[PDB]
Design a protein around this ligand. Structure first.
Ligand code: 793
Length: 283
């Protein structure tokens, strides 16, 4: 008998200062709180600390992230503390310190020798299975943006990981013949992750977003303007087109995305160079 099982979420109640040295160095800012760099007193290694005000909404978002941490392409939660900061109660999330910078920053800070079509596909597949894992366990991320994609280290061997579960939500409430519609109700959710994914691929290839701009998005109108898109194949554009469907119910599912040849065969796509890096050094 073999029985694979992992630990549940243990919310530690003791002061974080017992276990960790807390710096005044920032690695992330938002409206909801801050992300600081911390060191483990015992092991002496680098970590990230996300501070949130302790409301039931946050406690669930942590539970979803903790549940998601088993995925190699999702930033892993290590410890969760509930402490008293100021007068208010608050949550303290301990994560693996990702100091490899933002995704587009590292593509731009290459001093580029050009950036290939193949390497962009490798990036996409990794973000793909990050979404695939989430969707497979009924979690929609709902905030997949360039800011929330960070690399582990400064290494050229670094792993890309998806952060920020401040918008993640649970998509759930003989017979192997029944339809998925009859199996309970579900809103849009997962589809918006797929849109974000399509957006990211566009910016990855050329170097600019595809998009009354709020109308041009709702129209689904975007050029593939040259001489950037003159090198990219019809197959790739058709994939972006499938990911950039206006209608959510028409937009490609994650399972279909990962099955697609360009994604599945990350090591078969032509190694044709892109102008991406040059384009980012403008705005
Ligand atoms: C922008 C975002 N930034 C975020 C992160 N940054 C990391 C940095 C280093 N290592 C791991 C993660 C997260 O995690 C995360 O969420 C943020 C959200 C809420 C509050 C403040 C900031």
């Amino acid at each position: 008998p073999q029985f694979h099982v992992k630990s549940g979420l243990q919310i530690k109640k003791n002061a974080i200062i017992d276990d960790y040295k807390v710096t005044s160095q920032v690695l992330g800012l938002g409206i909801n709180g801050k992300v600081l760099q911390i060191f483990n007193k015992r092991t002496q290694e680098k970590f990230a600390l996300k501070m949130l005000q302790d409301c039931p909404k946050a406690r669930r978002e942590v539970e979803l992230h903790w549940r998601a941490s088993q995925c190699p392409h999702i930033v892993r939660i290590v410890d969760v503390y509930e402490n008293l900061y100021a007068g208010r109660k608050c949550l303290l999330i301990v994560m693996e310190c990702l100091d490899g910078g933002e995704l587009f920053s590292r593509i731009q800070d290459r001093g580029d020798q050009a950036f290939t079509e193949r390497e962009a596909s490798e990036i996409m597949k990794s973000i793909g299975e990050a979404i695939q894992y989430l969707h497979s366990i009924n979690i929609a991320h709902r905030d997949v943006k360039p800011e929330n994609l960070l690399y582990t280290s400064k290494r050229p061997n670094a792993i890309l990981k998806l952060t920020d579960f401040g918008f993640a939500k649970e998509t759930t409430s003989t017979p192997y013949y029944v339809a998925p519609e009859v199996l309970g109700p579900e809103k849009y959710d997962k589809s918006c992750d797929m849109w974000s994914l399509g957006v990211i691929m566009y910016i990855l290839l050329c170097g600019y977003p595809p998009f009354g701009m709020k109308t041009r998005i709702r129209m689904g109108q975007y050029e593939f303007p040259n001489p950037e898109w003159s090198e990219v194949s019809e197959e790739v554009k058709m994939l972006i087109r499938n990911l950039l469907k206006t209608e959510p119910t028409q937009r490609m599912t994650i399972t279909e995305f990962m099955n697609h040849p360009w994604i599945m065969q990350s090591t078969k796509v032509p190694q044709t160079p892109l102008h991406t890096s040059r384009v980012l050094k403008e705005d």
